[PDB]
Design a protein around this motif. Structure first.
Motif, mmCIF file in Angstrom:
data_model
loop_
_atom_site.group_PDB
_atom_site.id
_atom_site.type_symbol
_atom_site.label_atom_id
_atom_site.label_comp_id
_atom_site.label_asym_id
_atom_site.label_seq_id
_atom_site.Cartn_x
_atom_site.Cartn_y
_atom_site.Cartn_z
ATOM 1 N N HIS B 14 6.191 -0.777 -15.681
ATOM 2 C CA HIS B 14 6.183 -1.590 -14.468
ATOM 3 C C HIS B 14 5.616 -2.976 -14.745
ATOM 4 O O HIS B 14 6.180 -3.987 -14.310
ATOM 5 C CB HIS B 14 5.378 -0.885 -13.377
ATOM 6 C CG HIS B 14 5.329 -1.635 -12.082
ATOM 7 N ND1 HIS B 14 4.202 -2.301 -11.651
ATOM 8 C CD2 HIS B 14 6.266 -1.819 -11.123
ATOM 9 C CE1 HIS B 14 4.449 -2.867 -10.483
ATOM 10 N NE2 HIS B 14 5.694 -2.590 -10.140
ATOM 11 N N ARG B 102 -5.937 -1.971 -4.395
ATOM 12 C CA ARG B 102 -6.074 -2.024 -2.943
ATOM 13 C C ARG B 102 -6.497 -0.671 -2.388
ATOM 14 O O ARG B 102 -7.277 -0.599 -1.430
ATOM 15 C CB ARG B 102 -4.763 -2.488 -2.304
ATOM 16 C CG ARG B 102 -3.581 -1.570 -2.568
ATOM 17 C CD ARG B 102 -2.344 -1.984 -1.797
ATOM 18 N NE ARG B 102 -2.500 -1.771 -0.364
ATOM 19 C CZ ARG B 102 -2.274 -0.616 0.249
ATOM 20 N NH1 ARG B 102 -1.882 0.456 -0.419
ATOM 21 N NH2 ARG B 102 -2.447 -0.536 1.565
ATOM 22 N N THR B 103 -5.994 0.411 -2.977
ATOM 23 C CA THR B 103 -6.388 1.756 -2.591
ATOM 24 C C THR B 103 -7.362 2.282 -3.632
ATOM 25 O O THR B 103 -6.959 2.506 -4.784
ATOM 26 C CB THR B 103 -5.168 2.668 -2.490
ATOM 27 O OG1 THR B 103 -4.247 2.130 -1.531
ATOM 28 C CG2 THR B 103 -5.582 4.057 -2.050
ATOM 29 N N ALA B 108 -0.763 9.217 -8.628
ATOM 30 C CA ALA B 108 0.568 8.935 -9.156
ATOM 31 C C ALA B 108 1.625 9.029 -8.063
ATOM 32 O O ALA B 108 2.556 8.216 -8.017
ATOM 33 C CB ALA B 108 0.893 9.893 -10.302
ATOM 34 N N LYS B 110 1.163 8.470 -4.865
ATOM 35 C CA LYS B 110 1.008 7.211 -4.155
ATOM 36 C C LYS B 110 1.654 6.095 -4.969
ATOM 37 O O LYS B 110 1.425 6.012 -6.183
ATOM 38 C CB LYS B 110 -0.473 6.908 -3.923
ATOM 39 C CG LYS B 110 -0.757 5.599 -3.200
ATOM 40 C CD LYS B 110 -0.295 5.637 -1.754
ATOM 41 C CE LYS B 110 -0.727 4.383 -1.010
ATOM 42 N NZ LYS B 110 -0.053 3.163 -1.538
ATOM 43 N N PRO B 111 2.485 5.245 -4.357
ATOM 44 C CA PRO B 111 3.077 4.127 -5.103
ATOM 45 C C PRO B 111 2.022 3.272 -5.784
ATOM 46 O O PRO B 111 1.197 2.643 -5.115
ATOM 47 C CB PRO B 111 3.827 3.345 -4.019
ATOM 48 C CG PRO B 111 4.152 4.362 -2.984
ATOM 49 C CD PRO B 111 3.008 5.338 -2.983
ATOM 50 N N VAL B 112 2.040 3.254 -7.120
ATOM 51 C CA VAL B 112 0.999 2.565 -7.880
ATOM 52 C C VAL B 112 0.997 1.078 -7.558
ATOM 53 O O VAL B 112 -0.063 0.470 -7.368
ATOM 54 C CB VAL B 112 1.186 2.817 -9.387
ATOM 55 C CG1 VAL B 112 -0.032 2.338 -10.163
ATOM 56 C CG2 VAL B 112 1.454 4.291 -9.647
ATOM 57 N N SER B 113 2.181 0.469 -7.494
ATOM 58 C CA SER B 113 2.273 -0.932 -7.101
ATOM 59 C C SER B 113 1.786 -1.136 -5.671
ATOM 60 O O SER B 113 1.151 -2.151 -5.362
ATOM 61 C CB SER B 113 3.709 -1.416 -7.269
ATOM 62 O OG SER B 113 4.606 -0.493 -6.679
ATOM 63 N N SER B 114 2.070 -0.183 -4.783
ATOM 64 C CA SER B 114 1.500 -0.199 -3.442
ATOM 65 C C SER B 114 0.100 0.395 -3.399
ATOM 66 O O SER B 114 -0.510 0.434 -2.326
ATOM 67 C CB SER B 114 2.408 0.551 -2.466
ATOM 68 O OG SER B 114 3.713 0.004 -2.469
#
Lengths: 539, 223
Positions: B14, B102-103, B108, B110-114
């Motif tokens: 990514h 952010r989180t 995994a 969970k969207p890593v970019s999100s």
């Protein structure tokens, strides 16, 4: 500066490639983005953005719209809604991307992303996000830049250390970040089909059964959707349960509000998950042997240990004298509430509480005291408080402060009792607590001093300044002392500024220069009237 | 938290597909990013960052190095490289991309970019950098939310107006932060071999002259 205006295509493709991963871990430039992204409403906006060397803010969002659908069968539907804004604001139920032009006019020939920085929005808690992230992004970076640039080497400019200090002032000044947002509960973020079907299956009053859901009771996709919804709900309730305001950077009122808030929230969520819908959802997902969701729900409650953490109710035992203090306006009731709250703090011994948190709350109580006693003394109107009444109200306030000092010493004894408990686990032993009221009291006590001497300075004027009881110096000096007295009387009062105390010190050293002038005059009268003998008026 | 952890391969790929779109404005991953993939120290630091919730910050520094030159009168070339930073540092002539979770919990699924938060920086001036970015990042957004969320109608925290004044004085100080270019004296480059010949023929206690270089005085490429 101003340069060539970039085209829509290059940055549009760049943002299209960047978004879908950052938004939902993929999507590959969804068409909903490009629908209004290519729209003239966004197109002219971004043309102005690139061209105008004055706007450097923009907000491209994609709300996963919670489209409420009234059709029978389900409650809501997931939706996609791209949104364009030229200003930045908290988008609800969505994360957005902001772009700041580092160059007032941006072109494609130089790298667009080089002349423009990217920000990505947080929807969960944007304020806590922005604060922590600017801290972790600038404070070490700015410290390293200061070190390499040698700002400490060149003392001609010393404003960078001050701006570092004020960055620190920001980062450690607001940690709550509007904490305790009072989120007691949410809706049901699970599959809507099952919830609605069970709703019609129970409104009939016939105990919704296993079969009435049809193949959905054993459908792998239906059960997977139930598991995903249950996981979303469990993650949300874990996030709300793990919330805990820092004892510092707040106040005792914040602590009691947070305590009551979490109490009522756990009360309601320990009554919410017991609704028949949740029970039937869990039962019919386990019917297909969906054990992972069941064990997650069993273990990811995350509230039991918090329930015993709040099972101490001596907190409220202290909160009641805290309300008495907040209602208190007189000194006697103030330290009555202090005695009560000290007894309750001694009673906290049987319960379990974070000791560092308890010490921080004690300091917060001490400064809440400081504040309420400050407003009380301001109410007493010490600006022109009369001499004897000043001394009387001071005796009262200072004995109240000594009572609270005895309470402080007994709190140190209670801290020794805490250490007696602490040999059970032997963690950190660092203690440091100091209410700043001392300095307030400091000013207080020193004012008492002048009052004393001024009394001594009055009668002697009728006695020693009067001629054998010259007249010209007598009248001059009585005018001196009276005018200096009104000066030191109206110059400072209930004023709490310590620089006010220093200005009062300057006023009183002028006072004392007049006093010493009187001393020289009276001693001159002494010596020129001496030399006769020892007896009575001679010596 | 550590319940499910995104793999090294997926996160690194990514980043490999994300970095060239930013540090080259839509380019393709260079040999510097290849080294970033193969950098074992970076390979372990990214794992520590993804796993450990104690630190949620990581920084990748695409560095530009003063590559030595042998050309005919053309100054030293610049070579694109990479650097990995668990913390953040004052990069110099080296672009930076910061990724801070952010989180706080790591998942995994969970969207890593999100799950991450993306910042970036190019080295022009940290002064204007911080000033302008904090201005156009917090001022409109912060005041918009406090006015629109009803917090201005809530007395629970008068902390917000105080920190508004605080933000304003940050912007004032950082905009006035425009004083010095900070270029007092920089190393004088000639060439490695001439310098080391001079040093090696002087450390013996002898004055360097035209003779020590020997053949190097009439070599057109060397000159």
């Amino acid at each position: 500066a101003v340069q060539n205006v970039a085209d829509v295509s290059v940055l549009q493709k760049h943002l299209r490639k960047l978004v879908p991963l950052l938004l939902e871990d993929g999507g590959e430039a969804p068409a909903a983005l490009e629908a209004a992204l290519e729209e003239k409403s966004a197109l002219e906006q971004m043309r102005k953005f690139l061209s105008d060397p004055q706007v450097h803010t923009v907000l491209v969002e994609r709300s996963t719209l919670k489209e409420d659908v009234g059709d029978e069968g389900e409650e809501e539907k997931e939706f996609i809604s791209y949104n364009i804004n030229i200003d930045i604001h908290y988008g609800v139920k969505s994360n957005s991307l902001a772009f700041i032009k580092r160059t007032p006019v941006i072109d494609a020939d130089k790298p667009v992303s080089s002349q423009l920085r990217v920000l990505t929005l947080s929807e969960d808690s944007p304020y806590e996000t922005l604060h922590s992230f600017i801290s972790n992004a600038v404070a070490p970076f700015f410290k390293s830049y200061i070190r390499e640039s040698g700002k400490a080497d060149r003392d001609g400019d010393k404003m960078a250390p001050s701006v570092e200090k004020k960055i620190a002032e920001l980062e450690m000044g607001l940690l709550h970040l509007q904490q305790n947002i009072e989120i007691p509960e949410i809706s049901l973020p699970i599959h809507p089909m099952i919830t609605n079907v069970a709703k019609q299956c129970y409104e009939r009053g016939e105990k919704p059964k296993v079969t009435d859901f049809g193949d959905k009771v054993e459908d792998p996709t239906f059960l997977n959707q139930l598991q995903s919804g249950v996981n979303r709900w469990i993650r949300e309730i874990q996030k709300v349960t793990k919330l805990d305001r820092d004892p510092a950077s707040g106040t005792a009122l914040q602590e009691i509000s947070f305590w009551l808030n979490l109490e009522r929230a756990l009360y309601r969520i320990q009554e919410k998950r017991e609704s028949p819908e949740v029970l039937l959802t869990l039962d019919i997902l386990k019917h297909g042997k969906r054990f992972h969701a069941t064990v997650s729900f069993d273990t990811d409650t995350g509230l039991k240990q918090a329930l015993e953490t709040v099972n101490d109710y001596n907190p409220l035992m202290k909160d009641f004298p805290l309300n008495d203090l907040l209602s208190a306006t007189e000194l006697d009731k103030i330290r009555q509430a202090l005695v009560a709250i000290f007894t309750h703090l001694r009673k906290i011994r049987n319960t379990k509480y974070p000791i560092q948190r308890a010490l921080r709350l004690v300091e917060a109580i001490s400064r809440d005291l400081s504040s309420q006693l400050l407003k009380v003394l301001g109410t007493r109107k010490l600006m022109h408080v009369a001499y004897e009444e000043f001394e009387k109200v001071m005796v009262a306030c200072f004995e109240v402060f000594q009572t609270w000092d005895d309470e402080y010493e007994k709190l140190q004894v209670l801290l020794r009792d805490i250490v007696k408990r602490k040999r059970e686990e032997n963690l950190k032993m660092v203690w440091r607590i100091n209410p700043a009221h001392r300095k307030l009291q400091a000013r207080l006590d020193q004012m008492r001093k002048f009052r004393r001497q001024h009394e001594q300075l009055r009668a002697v004027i009728v006695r020693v300044l009067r001629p054998q009881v010259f007249d010209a110096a007598d009248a001059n000096a009585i005018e001196e002392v009276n005018l200096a007295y009104e000066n030191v009387k109206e110059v400072d009062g209930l004023d709490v500024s310590k620089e006010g105390t220093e200005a009062w010190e300057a006023a009183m050293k002028r006072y004392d220069e007049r006093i010493d002038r009187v001393e020289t005059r009276i001693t001159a009268r002494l010596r020129d009237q001496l030399g006769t003998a020892k007896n009575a008026n001679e010596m």
